[PDB]
Structure 1
Amino acid sequence: MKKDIHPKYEEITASCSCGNVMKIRSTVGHDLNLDVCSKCHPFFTGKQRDVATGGRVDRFNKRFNI
C-alpha cells in the first residue's frame, strides 16, 4: 500500500451498551460508544415480532360475548 495517500488506520475500542466490548482497527481516532451491537440485536437474538397476530375473531370474542 502507498504511504502518504491513505488515511491513518489505527486500533480502537468500541464499548457497547450491553457490555460487548470489542477492539477493531478504524480511523475515528477516539474511542467508540455503540448502542446496538451484533449480540444485543433483536434479529440476531431471534426475538423479531410480527404484524398479523390473529385477526378479527379474537378481538370480537374478547370484546363482545353473548
Structure 2
Amino acid sequence: MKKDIHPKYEEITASCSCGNVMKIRSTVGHDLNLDVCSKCHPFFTGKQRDVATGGRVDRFNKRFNIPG
C-alpha cells in the first residue's frame, strides 16, 4: 500500500450491549459501543433477545409497571 495517501487504520475495541467485545481494525480512531451486534440480533439467533438493560423498551417498562 502507498504510505501516506491512505487514512489511519488502527486496532480498537468494540463493545456490545450483549457484552460480546471485538478487537476490530478501522478508522474510527477510538473504542466504540454497539447497541446491536451479530449475536444481538433476532434474525441470526432466532431467539429475539430481550436484554434491553440500557434501552427504550425498558424505559417503557419501569415507567409503567403494568402486569401481563
Taking structure 1 as the reference length, the TM-score comes to 0.68
Deviations along 1:21-56, whole A, 9 cap, x unmatched? Answer: 111000111101001100010001114799999999
Please say if residues 17 and 35 of structure 2, whose CA atoms lie closer than 8 Å, have aligned partners that are also in contact.
Answer: yes
User: In the alignment, which residue of structure 2 is the partner of 1:57?
Assistant: 57
State the Cα distance separating 1:20 from its structure 2 match: 0.5
Contact 2:14 2:21 in 1 (8 A): yes
Question: Residue 38 of structure 1 corresponds to which residue in structure 2?
Answer: 38
RMSD: 10.3
With normalisation by structure 2, the TM-score equals 0.66
Q: Which has the larger radius of gyration?
A: 1
Q: How far apart in 2 are the matches of 1:40 and 1:5?
A: 36
Return 5+ residue gaps in structure 1 as ranges: none
Corresponding pairs, count: 66
Are the counterparts in 1 of residues 40 and 49 from structure 2 also a CA contact under 8 Å?
no
